Amino acid sequence: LTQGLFRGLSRQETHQQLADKKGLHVVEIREECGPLPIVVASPRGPLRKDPEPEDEVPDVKLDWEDVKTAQGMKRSVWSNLKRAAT
Amino acid sequence: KAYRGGHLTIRLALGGCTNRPFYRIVAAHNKCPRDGRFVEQLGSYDPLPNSHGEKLVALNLDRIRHWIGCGAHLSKPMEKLLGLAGFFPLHPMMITNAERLRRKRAREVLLASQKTDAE
Amino acid sequence: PISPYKDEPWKYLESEEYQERYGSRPVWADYRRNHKGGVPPQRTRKTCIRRNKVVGNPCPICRDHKLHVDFRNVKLLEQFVCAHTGIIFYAPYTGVCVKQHKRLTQAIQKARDHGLLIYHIPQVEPRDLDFSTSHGAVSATPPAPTLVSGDPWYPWYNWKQPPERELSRLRRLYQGHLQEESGPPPESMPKMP
Amino acid sequence: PYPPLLRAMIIAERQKNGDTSTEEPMLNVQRIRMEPWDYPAKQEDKGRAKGTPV
Amino acid sequence: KKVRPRLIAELARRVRALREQLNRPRDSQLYAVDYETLTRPFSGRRLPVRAW
Amino acid sequence: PMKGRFPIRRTLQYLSQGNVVFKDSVKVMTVNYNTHGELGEGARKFVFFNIPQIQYKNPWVQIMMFKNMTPSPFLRFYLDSGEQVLVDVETKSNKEIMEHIRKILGKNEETLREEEEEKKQLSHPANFGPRKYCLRECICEVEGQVPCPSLVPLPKEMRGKYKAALKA
Amino acid sequence: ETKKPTFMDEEVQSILTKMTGLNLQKTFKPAIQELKPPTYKLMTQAQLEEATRQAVEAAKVRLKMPPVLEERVPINDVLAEDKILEGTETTKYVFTDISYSIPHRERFIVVREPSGTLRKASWEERDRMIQVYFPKEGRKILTPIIFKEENLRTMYSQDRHVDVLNLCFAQFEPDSTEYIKVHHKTYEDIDKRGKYDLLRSTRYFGGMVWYFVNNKKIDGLLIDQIQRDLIDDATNLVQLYHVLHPDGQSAQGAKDQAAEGINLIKVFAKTEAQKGAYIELTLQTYQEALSRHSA
Amino acid sequence: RKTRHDPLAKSKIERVNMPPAVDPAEFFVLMERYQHYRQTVRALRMEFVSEVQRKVHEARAGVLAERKALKDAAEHR
């Protein structure tokens, strides 16, 4: 658990690396701030002029545990319990 | 469910807890229980005065006129609520019960007067 | 124990005895409940004080008698409200007893009613699409004829003395079961002097 | 006449629809023929006692 | 969904309706009255006090 | 993870994204596509992504598919009046097909909003009843009115226990 | 003949809209509410400019100025008086027609008093009952205690005038007496302490300008705009003032001199403005500073 | 409540409910009020009945309804 936790927390891609990789603006969308686009990171190099090809359906592997929760189907008497401050 | 005969009626369905009554106006079959199944809810009546000292009465006049045109009857307490509002005429016994109250109170004024006068 | 800040509780949080004991952290930071298991009960103890007697491990509010839960002590009520969502934490989060968590929710709701505590107030839309008072419902209606002449809406609201020939029919119709004839009622309701 | 409330709701629809008139709405009670309570009913639609002598 | 027939429920129904037509009481029995107790002996029911 | 390729298809969030709600006339929809051939590429993607979306919005419409029966793909609808609507879908993308049948046999946005609005009138806010059907159960939940006796005891003058005692 | 423009005229709406301005940082200030993990998108320079444009289109819908109405007339109408029911009841009945497909200002609400009088419910009773059977988020049956004198002053002390206006718009109707009193009082505290910036980039700025103009209290506001390099708005405020008051010393003087731009402020400052001296000094300082930058 | 087969109590055997006394004046006055009140309500009921018949016939056989049914059939072709 510890050897893997430190492993994934070190291989995480930041917002700045992502922009530099694809040369695009990283915009943050928040419900509390409405539709306002917040620029969190921009590429240092030449900003690309062409947009990313919009994908009709993404071929990304999902997790049944998350999909089952979003559909109001994961019943559990141990989830969302009132606990102390952490 | 299917009841032998019967008909639709616009009555009061008692609700609330002990010493706190709250009626809800509904259109239900005649044989159905008081607080049982109903066709539609057409208002509510709070007997107990509120902080402002006034009794609230909700009425879906647009729907009460629909069911009365479909063959629905009315209960006496509910016919006295529509007369107090101006939708129906004052029920005859709402008038006679007032006359009885007048004569009754005038009958008590005599004894009260005689006592203060004679004694 | 008589707290000197009973009338002015907001002066204890801005003193040096509070800073030497709590510092900059909330009063419930260094508090832990004693329960069996990893998952604690979903309710805290009803109260930490029973007939002027304190329990072994009092809550952050009952352990310090100088912390008074009042709607004026804004600086203490902010420690029990999230600074990012404006929601009051449940008791297991902080560890307070139900008696004091019921007093905090009131004081927090009473301070927001006096404008002492800041909370999110949304920008709602108007109730009505139009604002025209061109309707009888909100305006005057032509007084009906019977209302101008001081008459009832229907003629049969008033008492009408029936003929004598009709009463004899009733008397003959109900012979031996009768009641004294009642005359026209008074115009207005009597009253007890 | 119509009762107080119904009268006020029929006069407001007129004004809302644009029709301007000062006539009073009234119910035609000529169709309603009120018979006395002692008027002979129909015996060919009336029931009969069942055969359960006691 | 194939209901099992109830033949005895139809047999008695026909028999009852028939007996109600052959043993039907007459107006002489139904509408009789004892003028001393003022009760219909057929049903043993008292008449209203206003008709006595 | 979730089995199968493109697992997002088996999600309620994706099945409700279909914008093709057929009319009442449409009764049967038959799809004929070829497994191979560059021309029939779109028809195959239409059977792989959208048929789930169409059947979820039109559960009372029969959908039957046939493979490699004709040299070219096509769609055919069967209406209740006896009319058939043939639709050649060769040399077209799955989006063109999904947009084409929505214009000739699908409902518009005006016809949908109306139906939805009717439902809003089924739940009258004034009504009092269970939380499932109505917002409030009793009128004691309304500030100003007399609270429930369970929370706030009523005055001794308003309880039938003492009204009887005071009277007798 | 010659009608004075109203608050909803296209000419006045554009003027009050421009004075308000558009600030996305304050228009969409982060709300203190339940949160979710944000979503990120990879955008180009053009895709970013279009998204920033869609926020401008939505912010103009959130800044829509509420209409300004006059204090509604009391309701004193009797449908019938049934003297036979007098004395038969101790409390009064309040009947409320509850039909979904009816606007609330065309809805019938009557009252049967203990004297047998069937009258119509007053404005205070109509708005109260409509909230019992057609509740609206944010509105309460019983008038809150925040709108009292002492409590309102507290909110003013924390510079929360926009919050008091949002409470007043959700609890009272635009034509109610309390909606006008609460708004007018708030406008008079800002003028006293010069807090005009608070309502900027909001939907309550126009309604505040419309009150000072009709009551001739635009001296403080006109100064603030000059101290913030907002002459365009300062001149439009004097233009608006002249329109609603054509028969004024400043309006007539302007016509004679055909004043334009900064001149209008000078004409208005001497003739009608109460604080003529202070305005000239403030306008003087600005013009001098502007000259240096031009060099 | 009881049924047809259930018997009667022994305390109600010798029971006679005497009708109430009658006030000749009030009885006649009250007998006329019901006569009018019930006639005023019989007219209202007929009015409301005519409105329910109208809407239904209008809906299935109306001007606007038949003006839209033809538009949907013309747009279909």
Ligand code: FES
């Ligand atoms: S629930 Fe309303 S009174 Fe008990």
Ligand SMILES: [Zn+2]
């Ligand atoms: Zn405690």
